[PDB]
Design a protein around this nucleic acid. Structure first.
Ligand SMILES: [Zn+2]
Ligand SMILES: [Zn+2]
Lengths: 91, 326, 662, 209, 199, 100, 62, 117
DNA sequence: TAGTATGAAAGTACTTGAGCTTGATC
DNA sequence: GATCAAGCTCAAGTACTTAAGTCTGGTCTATACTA
């Protein structure tokens, strides 16, 4: 299964960043540079960073090289613990 | 701020905070008999103490591929090699064609009055029979010893063994002692004060040696060396070889020497109180956090000096009690 | 660089020209009015002038539907102005006009006014850049270390310091390594050479050893070759380098990319920033290793860290440039984010609201007000002590403060080496004027005739050398470097030459005639080592000296005659320098210069001491500073006393300035 | 190679005799100051061949106060002594109903052997010494004052006189060269008499730890 | 004469006619000989100045009573200041094999290495003034650096021995009641009333 | 131990310890509500990790590797240890040697 | 500029700090002089326990 | 003896490493990358000069005579051309204790003969 | 708007991996 | 006689502290967010 990577986003604009990145995926999925990531998680109570479901940090970087909101996390990304998928989606 | 000696605050410092690596550690070697009067035997003792590696007496080394020792590559080494190879002395079948020709110098060799024989025995002892060594007579204009390995590759191992022997191999002397200085003391604090048959004090002017290293256990165990007056400035070696009362006295002598070098004077009761406080626990109680905060003086007395928070942490975790004595 | 941002539509926002008006002040009503320094000192204002820059924004969306828009004289920010400078309102004013403005005609200026406080920038010393210096640390894993703080002509990033060290003896021999920037692990020099496209060991050595007939150097470099021989191509060399860094890419592709850009941008930026990395950097790195080999064999002397020739004085120019560059970057950043959040909504934006003019203004104001050299947030990583309050206790103190130097070694340091009065302080710094507290030797004071270079472009010199018989570095063959003499310019190895005698004689003739080469240019011809180092950089402390012919001075009586009637025939110091009679000599050139204290030394004596003088001192008393020049008969007192007086002259009462009632 | 070995053996024997004499063991004056010539005539000058062998140098002395309180001194031939040699000497002592012994090693001693010197302490009080530190008698040095091991009666009187406890006196490490020379263990008090430039003679007392 | 002897020593070493002394390098031997010649000249000139002072001279009146100064100061004010030393050695070659650009390369002579042949009254030459400034600066640096190390030493010594005192039983004990000395100074006497004597 | 002195105006300024205790009570309350109602476990550990960093930096700010507890004016709040670590502290600056 | 009128200082039951109820620092605040550690060491040598107590406890912050 | 210079291959021009041919018992130099081999002509593979018996006359260069900071003398003329004036300087090279030795160079162009007294 | 909120330190003591003795086994 | 494993010894690191005394004067000290 794909792994979750934590990418830092502007505080309070994680939802906007997710909407923008999914719109860009819609616009560029049929192009020569589609987004190989699977999904994105922006928990309601998690501010400052979001989770990207991808197999490689390379895929994560190619997905987040869009809006500048994720520039700070563009330099490096951090794995989400294997046990942590269950906790990711808890409300 | 003969040889360079540390004085003033740096030396006072190294004494109060016992240092395992002083800046100018040295010995004060005193001779026993005729060597104390003449200079030739004294030189023999000096050479018997001063550490001598093969690099000090070697002029140049060279590695050759000599396939058959009968007809060597070099032309000047063909006379004594056949004089040594005419008879089977070693396992000629277990021989390697890679030669290590070392050339020494008559000057440094004659000063230390060594002989190629002794060098050969040192090589055959340090490397056993695995490394065969031969040499010519002490008559040629150039000293050379031809070396071979007995059986990484051979050439690389030779270049590695070349440096092994060029440094660690101690021909003569005692290691950790780089140089030794011989001189006649003009001051009476280093002369030999005897009591004549009439009962008057006479200060004999005798030769003494000053080393750049410190190895008391080995220097004291040598012939013609005085095992009573020979001392050192490295209080660590004194405590490790002679003990706590000896380091107590040696420490007082070093402090007195540091304070009196500039002509000043301090009452002995103060130097004694310091030297006793630094030795009243059997070990060298350094004047630092590592020596003062390690005794049972109480957490408040230690926190006021150094490691204020850490000491109180250990005291709390251990339930220590300050008896309010200091 | 033009900031290209896109959601689609894109905008570049490219700048072209700037315009800096005179100092002005805007009241609440907004009426622009000129502000005089006295008004700033009284109203606690900041004597600053506005900066106007021209901007051009072109819209590019699709179908080549382009249109350009120009914003002429855009107010980007305010800049504090140095009193009595060209842009200061007190420029060219007569003593009477200055009196009308309630200003002292004797005030030398050279200071700023921030919130009514007279702030002065203290010249900060720093190790010279683009130069190779081979040192030797007593306690370290390396025996000899050859470092070179490299930075491009137009500094844009911090100094990328590269080290080329040699491992101490005790695998088989002594190994040479290289501590590259952005890499936390040593790298053998051969790998770096292979990463630049030189795989053959012969070509690598040809760049390192210029005379193959010297087997001593070849045996000394042999361990490094035998240590790195499995790698024989550029791809792996780059991959290995990328693996040693702190960002090891899981894929070898980005590793190679990271190493390529590091070796192309961070490693030796003054030696190149593109293909140059092999066209010159390999050659330079070769010379960098060559210096290390010469140092290990004793064929050359180690460099002294406390030598003025090897140091530079950071004045207000190079200091404020560092601030303006860092803040301009922060401004372009804030303009990026501002326009970014607008174009994402699919609409245009007005740059007038995007330019946060408060950035440059409050930044320069804060830096010159508090002294913390850096951003307002980094109040701990920045170095304080710069921009001190001008001492107005006496005119001697004021002059001394404006001519003060400072070494950033840190007052906490107890090493006497950097605090000692080095032999190179002759004529450039006052040997007596220095504090007696915890800053002895660190805080110094310039000599009376000391002049710190301002800077110049090396382009005209390079054009003259290329036009001359000099041969470039890429056109020559390594076999010609043996007998030829090297030629460096601001530390950049440019080429080689054959007859350097007539070369020097020509360059000197040009500098003495105020030709293409200006007087501040230094030309040092090391003779034993065939290097010829030319310098045009700023911060090079120098002083004037009288040129000397075969055995006589060039300052004839006709000059003194014209100088006596200086108010009538307008014959000043510039005309004296242009006549080729005086020359500005720096500390690095003094090593190759043979001075004469007085003309008496040039006469024929019963025993000839030198008989081949080339320069002469104007007057030996000029080696003293300001607070030491006031001492009568200082050559008759114990030196500490002259130092204590130099420290008391600044504390003595008097009339610190004529306009003290205002 | 050989004359030095016999010289070392002689010097070590002289130092051992001085040591045992200082511990209070019965040692004749002749062997106390034995010249090198007397040693060569009584033992030999050929240690490389085996004459004398280090096994011959074994000493056995008896205390002046108690004749049955004897003490051994062994000189192993192996440079690095192993546990087997200690087992040999321990059994030797068991056979000869002796409790105290000295092992003069050449190069050093293995860790397991040192532990064996610590576990059999209440049964056999046996110590170890390096020949390199035995070639000189440290008590003749000018820095080393005159030490004297006090008896339990003398210590009780000392503590009762100054009215202090044992933990209040200055300390001396049991591993100290002088402490090893006099063979003192924890709880014992050693009296040191040293010359003083302020009073002439100063007597101090150190507790072993 | 001193400068002529130094010139002769330089000619000997330059012609290899000078041999090193036991335990010292050739360079060290040369510098020791030069330093010896200069020190002898300074002492001889100083004695000559001291012999020339009259009983009414005030400098002599200061040195005799010891109120302030010494014979060395008089020698420096009247006859010759002497050699200027940096780190116990002569003025080093700050430049490339030179002390200052006014001297030739490889000039180990007295004036080039910092011999101040003039007195403070006659006035120092420019080079001698710069070298004297070096000799002075080393004193200021030492006076400004030793304060931290010595003060830290004074603190360490106090904190280690601040509770050690002479109890009522005449013995010296610390805060832990441990005994450091059975009698203060091994004799139980205070250091004020004692004084030097002769046996 | 943490006196809130009034400036030239009515404005009241808090001590470094008060500013730190505020952060501790903030993260503590967050942890309490995050455990009272079902919340993501990693989240809990997260606030905990941060709580550990706050409590540590209140008593010891000079932790190697970790970021300094910078608060107002982006400056690290003085840690209780720094108040009594050495010179100018409590023991040496207010107990052993003090104003008189 | 180092005159005596700008250096003369005296204090007797003046203002005190807020954190610790000890005298202020500086002439501008009518502060007290610092009875540093070196002074404590000196009075310890004199054996003056009452003076050392009055200075560190009764005259500073009882 | 003298030091030994490096031999470069003809294929990749890289340096060869000392190797021996076991069948004929002869010294060979082969490249560790390609399959090139060469017959050695010196038979010596390593030379270390502990004494540092270096003749400084090869390290000095005639262009040094153009240095105005160097002292000149007329008492030691040149043996190759007879010029009277000549510059003199010390060894100044590390690893050489007898550094007080003077090295002379002729100031005449097209000669610059060097020697030692 | 009106207000909340975001390049010139050195020392000791302790932990870790490498090499080696004695054991338990074979 | 042989072996591998346990574990003791040694040289390589890391974690942590400390760096003279007192005294005076002077300047300077946040603004992003987003409603
Ligand atoms: Zn090849
Ligand atoms: Zn000639």
């Amino acid at each position: 299964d794909p792994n979750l990577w934590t990418v830092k986003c502007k505080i309070g604009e994680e939802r906007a960043t997710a909407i923008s990145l999914m719109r860009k995926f819609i616009a560029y999925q049929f192009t020569d540079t589609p987004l190989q990531i699977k999904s994105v998680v922006a928990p309601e109570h998690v501010k400052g960073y979001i989770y990207v479901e991808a197999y490689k940090q390379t895929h994560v970087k190619q997905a987040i090289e869009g809006v500048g909101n994720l520039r700070l996390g563009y330099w490096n990304q951090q794995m989400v613990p294997i046990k942590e998928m269950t906790d990711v989606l808890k409300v | 701020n003969a040889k360079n000696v540390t004085l003033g605050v740096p030396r006072l410092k190294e004494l109060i905070n016992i240092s395992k690596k002083p800046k100018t550690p040295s010995l004060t070697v005193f001779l026993l008999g005729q060597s104390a009067r003449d200079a030739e035997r004294a030189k023999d003792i000096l050479c018997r103490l001063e550490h001598t590696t093969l690099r000090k007496v070697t002029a140049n080394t060279a590695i050759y591929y000599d396939p058959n020792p009968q007809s060597t590559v070099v032309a000047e080494d063909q006379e004594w090699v056949n004089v040594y190879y005419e008879m089977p002395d070693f396992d000629v079948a277990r021989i390697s064609p890679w030669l290590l020709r070392v050339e020494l110098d008559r000057k440094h060799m004659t000063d230390r009055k060594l002989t190629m024989e002794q060098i050969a025995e040192k090589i055959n002892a340090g490397f056993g029979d695995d490394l065969n060594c031969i040499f010519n007579d002490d008559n040629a204009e150039k000293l050379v010893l031809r070396i071979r390995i007995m059986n990484m590759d051979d050439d690389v191992f030779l270049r590695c063994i070349e440096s092994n022997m060029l440094t660690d191999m101690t021909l003569q002397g005692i290691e950790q002692i780089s140089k030794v200085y011989m001189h006649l003391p003009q001051t009476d604090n280093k002369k030999k004060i005897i009591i004549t048959e009439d009962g008057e004090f006479k200060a004999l002017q005798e030769w003494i040696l000053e080393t750049d290293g410190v190895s008391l256990m080995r220097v004291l165990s040598e012939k013609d060396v005085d095992p009573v007056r020979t001392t050192s400035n490295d209080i660590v070696e004194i405590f490790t070889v002679l003990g706590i009362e000896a380091v107590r006295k040696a420490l007082e002598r070093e402090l007195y020497h540091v304070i009196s070098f500039d002509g000043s004077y301090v009452n002995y009761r103060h130097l004694a109180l310091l030297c006793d406080t630094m030795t009243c626990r059997g070990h060298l109680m350094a004047i630092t956090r590592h020596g003062v905060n390690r005794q049972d003086t109480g957490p408040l007395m230690k926190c006021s000096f150094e490691e204020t928070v850490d000491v109180l942490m250990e005291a709390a975790a251990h339930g220590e009690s300050d008896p309010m004595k200091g | 660089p033009p900031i290209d941002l896109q959601a689609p539509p894109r905008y570049l926002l490219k700048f072209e020209q700037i315009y800096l008006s005179k100092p002005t002040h805007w009241e609440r009503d907004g009426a622009p009015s000129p502000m005089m320094p006295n008004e700033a000192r009284l109203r606690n204002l900041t004597y600053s002038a506005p900066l106007y820059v021209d901007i051009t924004k072109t819209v590019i969306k699709e179908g080549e539907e382009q249109l350009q828009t120009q914003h002429q004289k855009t107010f980007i920010g305010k800049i504090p102005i140095m009193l009595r400078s060209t842009y200061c309102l007190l420029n060219g004013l007569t003593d009477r006009d200055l009196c009308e403005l309630n200003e002292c005609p004797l005030d030398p200026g050279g200071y700023f006014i921030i919130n009514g406080s007279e702030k002065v920038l203290i010249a900060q010393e720093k190790m010279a850049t683009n130069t190779v210096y081979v040192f030797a640390k007593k306690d370290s894993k390396y025996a000899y270390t050859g470092e070179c703080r490299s930075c491009l002509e137009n500094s844009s990033r911090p100094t990328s310091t590269i080290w080329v060290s040699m491992l101490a003896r005790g695998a088989i021999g002594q190994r040479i390594v290289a501590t590259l920037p952005y890499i936390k692990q040593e790298v053998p020099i051969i790998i770096v050479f292979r990463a630049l496209g030189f795989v053959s060991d012969r070509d690598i050595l040809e760049h390192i050893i210029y005379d193959f007939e010297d087997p001593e150097m070849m045996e000394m470099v042999k361990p490094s070759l035998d240590e790195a021989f499995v790698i024989q191509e550029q791809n792996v060399a780059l991959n290995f380098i990328g693996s040693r860094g702190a960002k090891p890419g899981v894929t070898k592709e980005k590793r190679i990319k990271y190493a390529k850009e590091v070796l192309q941008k961070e490693m030796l930026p003054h030696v190149g920033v593109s293909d140059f990395c092999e066209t010159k950097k390999a050659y330079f790195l070769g010379y960098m290793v060559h210096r290390l080999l010469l140092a290990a064999l004793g064929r050359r002397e180690l460099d002294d860290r406390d030598h003025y020739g090897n140091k530079r004085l950071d004045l207000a120019g190079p200091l404020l440039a560092f601030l303006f560059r860092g803040m301009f970057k922060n401004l372009l950043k804030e303009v990026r984010i501002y326009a970014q959040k607008f174009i994402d909504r699919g609409k245009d934006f007005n740059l007038e609201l995007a330019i946060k003019t408060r950035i440059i203004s409050d930044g320069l104001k804060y830096s010159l007000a508090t002294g913390n050299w850096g951003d307002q947030k980094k109040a701990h990583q920045a170095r304080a002590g710069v921009s001190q309050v001008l001492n107005r206790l006496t005119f001697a103190s004021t002059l001394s403060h404006l001519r003060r130097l400072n070494s950033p070694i840190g007052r906490d340091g107890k090493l006497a080496k950097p605090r000692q009065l080095h032999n190179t302080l002759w004529g450039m710094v006052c040997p007596a004027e220095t504090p007696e507290g915890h800053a002895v030797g660190l805080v110094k004071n310039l000599a009376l005739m000391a002049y710190i270079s301002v800077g110049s472009q090396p382009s005209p010199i390079l054009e003259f050398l290329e036009e001359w018989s000099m041969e470039n570095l890429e056109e020559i063959s390594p076999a010609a470097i043996a007998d030829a003499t090297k030629i460096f310019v601001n530390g950049c190895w440019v080429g080689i030459h054959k007859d350097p005698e007539q070369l020097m004689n020509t360059l000197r003739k040009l500098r003495r005639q105020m030709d293409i080469i200006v007087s501040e240019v230094s030309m040092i011809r090391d003779i034993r080592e065939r290097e010829i180092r030319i310098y045009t950089d700023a911060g090079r402390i120098c002083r004037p000296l009288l040129i000397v012919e075969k055995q006589k001075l060039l300052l004839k009586k006709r000059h003194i005659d014209q100088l006596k009637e200086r108010e009538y025939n307008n014959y000043s110091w510039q005309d004296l320098v242009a006549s080729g009679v005086v020359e500005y000599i720096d500390t690095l050139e003094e090593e190759t210069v043979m001075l004469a204290m007085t003309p008496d030394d040039l006469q024929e004596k019963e025993v000839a001491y030198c008989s081949t003088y080339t320069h002469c001192e104007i007057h030996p008393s000029m080696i003293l500073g300001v607070c030491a020049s006031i001492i009568p008969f200082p050559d008759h007192n114990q030196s500490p006393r002259n130092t204590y007086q130099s420290a008391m002259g600044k504390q003595a009462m008097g009339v610190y300035i004529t306009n003290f009632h205002v | 190679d050989d004359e030095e070995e016999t010289y070392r053996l002689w010097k070590i024997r002289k130092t051992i005799m001085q040591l045992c004499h200082d511990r209070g063991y019965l040692v004749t004056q002749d062997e106390l100051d034995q010249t090198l010539e007397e040693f060569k005539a009584q033992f030999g000058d050929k240690p490389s061949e085996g004459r004398p062998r280090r096994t011959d140098l074994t000493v056995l002395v008896a205390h002046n106060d108690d004749p049955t309180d004897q003490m051994f001194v062994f000189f192993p031939e192996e440079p690095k002594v192993g546990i087997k040699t200690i087992k040999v000497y321990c059994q030797r002592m068991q056979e000869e109903n002796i409790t105290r012994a000295l092992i003069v090693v050449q190069q050093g001693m293995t860790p397991s052997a040192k532990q064996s010197l610590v576990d059999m302490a209440p049964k056999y009080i046996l110590e170890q010494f390096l020949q390199q530190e035995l070639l000189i008698n440290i008590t003749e040095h000018e820095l080393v004052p005159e030490h004297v091991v006090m008896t339990k009666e003398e210590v009780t009187e000392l503590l009762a006189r100054y009215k202090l406890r044992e933990n209040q006196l200055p300390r001396i490490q049991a591993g100290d060269p002088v402490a090893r020379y006099f063979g003192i263990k924890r709880g014992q008090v050693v009296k040191i008499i040293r010359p003083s430039e302020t009073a002439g003679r100063y007597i101090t007392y150190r507790l072993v730890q | 004469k001193a400068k002529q002897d130094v010139i002769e020593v330089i000619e000997k070493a330059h012609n290899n006619e000078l041999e090193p002394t036991p335990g010292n390098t050739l360079r060290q031997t040369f510098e020791n000989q030069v330093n010896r010649i200069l020190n002898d000249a300074r002492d001889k000139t100083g004695s000559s100045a001291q012999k020339s002072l009259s009983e009414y001279n005030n400098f002599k009146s200061m040195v005799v009573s010891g109120a302030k100064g010494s014979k060395i100061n008089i020698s420096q004010v009247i006859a010759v200041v002497g050699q200027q030393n940096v780190e116990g050695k002569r003025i080093p070659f700050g430049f490339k094999h030179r002390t200052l650009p006014h001297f030739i390369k490889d000039d180990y002579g007295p004036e080039s290495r910092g011999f101040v042949e003039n007195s403070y009254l006659a006035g120092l030459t420019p080079t001698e003034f710069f070298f004297h400034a070096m000799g002075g600066r080393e004193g200021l640096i030492d006076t400004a650096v030793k304060t931290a190390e010595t003060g830290y030493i004074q603190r360490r010594l106090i904190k280690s021995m601040e509770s050690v005192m002479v109890k009522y039983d005449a013995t010296v004990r610390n805060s832990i009641n441990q005994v450091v000395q059975l009698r203060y100074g091994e004799d139980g006497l205070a250091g004020e009333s004692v004084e030097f004597q002769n046996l | 131990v943490r006196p809130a002195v009034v400036m030239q105006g009515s404005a009241r300024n808090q001590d470094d310890l008060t500013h730190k205790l505020a952060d501790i009570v903030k993260i503590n309350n967050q942890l309490r509500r995050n455990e009272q109602n079902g919340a993501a476990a990693h989240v809990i550990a997260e606030d905990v990790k941060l709580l550990q960093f706050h409590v540590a930096t209140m008593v010891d700010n000079e932790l190697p590797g970790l970021p300094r507890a910078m608060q107002k004016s982006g400056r690290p709040l003085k840690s209780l240890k720094q108040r009594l670590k050495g010179k100018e502290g409590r023991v040496r600056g207010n107990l052993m040697g003090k104003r008189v | 500029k180092h005159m005596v009128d700008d250096k003369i200082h005296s204090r007797a039951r003046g203002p005190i700090q807020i954190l610790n109820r000890q005298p202020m620092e500086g002439r501008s605040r009518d502060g007290g002089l610092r009875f540093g550690e070196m002074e404590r060491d000196c009075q310890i040598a004199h054996g003056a326990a009452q003076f050392l107590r009055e200075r560190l406890f009764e005259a500073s912050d009882p | 003896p003298g030091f030994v210079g490096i031999r470069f291959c003809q294929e990749c021009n890289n340096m060869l490493y000392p190797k021996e041919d076991k069948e004929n018992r002869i010294l060979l130099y082969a490249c560790r990358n390609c399959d090139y081999q060469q017959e050695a002509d010196n038979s010596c593979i390593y030379v270390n000069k502990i004494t540092h018996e270096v003749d400084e006359l090869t390290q000095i260069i005639a262009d040094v005579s153009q240095d105005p900071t160097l002292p000149r003398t007329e008492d030691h003329p040149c043996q190759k051309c007879g010029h009277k004036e000549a510059v003199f300087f010390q060894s100044h090279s590390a690893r050489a204790e007898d550094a007080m030795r003077l090295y002379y160079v002729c100031t005449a162009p097209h000669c610059g003969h060097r020697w030692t007294e």
